[PDB]
Design a protein around this ligand. Structure first.
Ligand SMILES: CCCCCCCC/C=C\CCCCCCCCCCCC(N)=O
Ligand SMILES: CCCCCCCC/C=C\CCCCCCCCCCCC(N)=O
Lengths: 164, 164
């Protein structure tokens, strides 16, 4: 305890229904975080992070540009998203998520594997993976888009490799 | 039947274990395909595709550049991968997948949502989801890389919206 996120091997994903039945996936290419944890016992002590909203991906310029617009994220007015863990208990990461200028308490379900050793450079690391779901409309993201076109519900998955 | 894949809302995903405990996900940004199907009954009649191996993504240059080397895919020698369905039965796409110059039989579990109507332009479509797994080593890709560094098992997910 503490840990630094390896960015080449770490990821922040979302998945949202498109037209009810197809799952549209994307990432934020640019994020940062703080982690402090006991690899034995697997307790998380510190867990916060930030996403840079302009780095949203999805792999389609048209869609992604439209996502940074006032119709969805409003990147100009809100360049960042943030999450601060406020409580850890047995796999539950309770925390305040802030998106589009709104903060809501949420809970991510998490899994830690640790202590691990990078078989190349011999350095100690941990994998942290977490999953939640939120309603984009609770954060006022895309009110004008119906659930039948863009799902209200958004699955969040974090996949982190972090070096002691 | 026939149908024409909407490339803007379709994707080809893979997922493989990194150092056993974390998943590396990525896509082929560029692919083509043929589909013929019955909206009712949900029978698939024709299902084939090609991917351009150079479009491999993963969002990491050092990694993606390595994947394209003779160490893995050798894109300079095998520019393409391809799949053709050989038989459709009780929700399963049986077919032949060709990667790195090797063809092997693979089974994909399919899920068809059809008939669907585009809420905006009222045009008819379907969502086709297909999932399966291969051993990358069965095709000779990355023989020198241990399963504990890069998983031998690779999960394939196809997510297509296709318009009549
Ligand atoms: C890294 C440690 C702390 C984690 C920071 C968490 C930030 C939250 C990560 C994801 C948050 C969810 C953002 C909502 C994305 C959904 C965007 C709407 C996509 C619409 C798709 C479309 N069809 O146009
Ligand atoms: C209908 C289209 C036909 C194509 C269907 C095939 C879909 C994908 C097929 C194979 C995917 C194999 C991908 C395995 C890539 C290995 C990724 C290794 C990443 C980490 C490597 C490292 N050294 O860090």
């Amino acid at each position: 305890k503490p840990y630094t996120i390896d960015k080449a091997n770490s990821s922040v994903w979302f998945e949202v229904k498109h037209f009810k039945f197809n799952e549209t996936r994307g990432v934020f290419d640019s994020f940062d975080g703080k982690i402090d944890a006991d690899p034995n016992t697997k307790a998380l002590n510190v867990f916060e992070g930030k996403i840079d909203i302009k780095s949203i991906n999805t792999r389609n310029k048209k869609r992604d540009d439209h996502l940074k617009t006032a119709e969805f994220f409003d990147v100009v007015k809100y360049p960042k998203g943030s999450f601060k863990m406020t409580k850890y208990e047995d796999g539950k990461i309770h925390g305040d998520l802030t998106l589009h200028g709104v903060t809501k308490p949420v809970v991510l379900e998490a899994k830690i594997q640790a202590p691990l050793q990078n078989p190349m450079n011999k350095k100690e690391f941990m994998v942290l993976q977490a999953e939640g779901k939120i309603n984009r409309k609770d954060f006022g993201i895309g009110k004008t888009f119906s659930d039948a076109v863009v799902g209200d519900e958004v699955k969040i998955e974090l996949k982190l490799e972090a070096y002691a």
